[PDB]
């Protein structure tokens, strides 16, 4: 339904064969589901309408906080103690929604592998392959970093990389 | 080692400059002061209780002069402490003042210029 975005959560537009009779004997499934729509669906509908019209008459709503950005911890002197703060609060909730920017990949790949059934070998490939971009970017940000992590560590980590792949690229320049 | 013994100007037996008059006494509810009254009220009870009298009823006027002697010492003591503590600072700060080549304030580097080691954790 509506309660989720159907573009960070994509579905295939769900072709489902129409029934082709072929024998004269009756369908105990459409039998016992009929029996089950009349004795089952029907009364949680009700309770459920009745729930829904006590709702709407007592509507009040939420909202989804908002932050604005600081300075990074690049740009915070070596023992400027206020700004350090503020750059490593703001560290800790990138690191928080890129996990959650995982788990949302991950959560379409296990579902395209259960959806596709027997063809999920060829037909996951693309799910696959974000899965793989993204692990390898948070890989790279995150791994390794231990507990009592920080966005010094961080930094210390990408400045090694950032050097290591500058001395790489300067060495194959030479060749 | 003497740090203070010698500093100019010290009287030798005062306990309380005049100069101490130009800092702000302790307020009479400083937690300091109350538990020294509280060192007091333990005495009296510790009192009560070596001469086998009733410890928390025995001698009403008795403890309230103990609360009373400790909180009037220790006024007197969180006084001097802190002109101390003042006097410290004070001649830190006059030091740090007249020695500027001992003391200088160089270059602030950003932590996007200062290169750390890095040592994975695995
Ligand atoms: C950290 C946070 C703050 C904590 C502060 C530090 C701890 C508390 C303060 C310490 C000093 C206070 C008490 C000193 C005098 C006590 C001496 C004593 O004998 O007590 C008996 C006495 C009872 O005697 P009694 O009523 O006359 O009749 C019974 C007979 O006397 C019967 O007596 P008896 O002689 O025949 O009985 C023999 C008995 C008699 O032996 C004793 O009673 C032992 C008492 C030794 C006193 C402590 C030593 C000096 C203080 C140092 C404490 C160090 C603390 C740091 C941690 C290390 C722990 C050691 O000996 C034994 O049975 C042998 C037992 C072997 C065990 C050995 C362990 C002893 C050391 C443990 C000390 C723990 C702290 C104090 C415990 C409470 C004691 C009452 O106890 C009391 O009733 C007094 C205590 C309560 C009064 C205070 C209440 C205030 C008013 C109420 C309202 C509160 C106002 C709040 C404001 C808000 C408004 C609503
Ligand atoms: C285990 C607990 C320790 C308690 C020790 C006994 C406490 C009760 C004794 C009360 C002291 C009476 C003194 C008040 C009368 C005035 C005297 C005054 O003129 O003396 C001054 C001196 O002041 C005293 O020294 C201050 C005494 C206060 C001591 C308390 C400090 C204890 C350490 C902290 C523990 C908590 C204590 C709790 C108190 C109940 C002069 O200074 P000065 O002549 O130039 O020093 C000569 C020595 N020098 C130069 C080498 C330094």
């Known amino acids: 339904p509506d309660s989720w975005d159907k573009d960070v959560y994509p579905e295939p537009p769900r072709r489902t064969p129409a029934p082709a009779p072929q024998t004269s004997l009756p369908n105990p499934v459409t039998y016992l589901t009929k029996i089950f729509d009349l004795l089952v669906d029907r009364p949680v509908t009700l309770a459920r309408e009745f729930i829904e019209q006590q709702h709407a008459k007592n509507r009040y709503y939420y909202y989804h906080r908002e932050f604005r950005r600081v300075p990074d911890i690049t740009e915070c002197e070596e023992k400027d103690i206020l700004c350090m703060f503020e750059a490593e609060m703001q560290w800790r909730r990138d690191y928080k929604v890129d996990q959650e920017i995982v788990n949302i990949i991950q959560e379409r790949l296990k579902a395209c592998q259960q959806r596709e059934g027997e063809s999920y070998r060829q037909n996951c490939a693309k799910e696959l392959e974000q899965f793989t971009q993204v692990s390898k970017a948070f890989q790279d940000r995150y791994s390794d970093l231990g507990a009592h992590y920080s966005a010094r560590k961080c930094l210390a980590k990408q400045k090694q990389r950032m050097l290591a792949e500058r001395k790489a690229a300067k060495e194959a320049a030479a060749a | ?122």
């Open chain 2, 1 to 122: 080692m003497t740090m203070m013994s010698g500093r100019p100007g010290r009287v030798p037996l005062q306990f309380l400059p005049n100069e101490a008059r130009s800092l702000p006494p302790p307020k009479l509810t400083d937690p300091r002061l109350v538990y020294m009254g509280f060192l007091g009220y333990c005495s009296g009870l510790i009192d009560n209780a070596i001469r086998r009298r009733p410890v928390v009823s025995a001698g009403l006027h008795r403890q309230l002069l103990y609360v009373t002697s400790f909180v009037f010492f220790g006024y007197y003591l969180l006084k001097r402490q802190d002109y101390m503590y003042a006097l410290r600072d004070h001649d830190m700060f006059a030091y740090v003042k007249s020695h500027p080549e001992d003391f200088p304030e160089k270059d602030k580097k950003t932590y996007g210029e200062i290169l750390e080691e890095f040592h994975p954790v695995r």
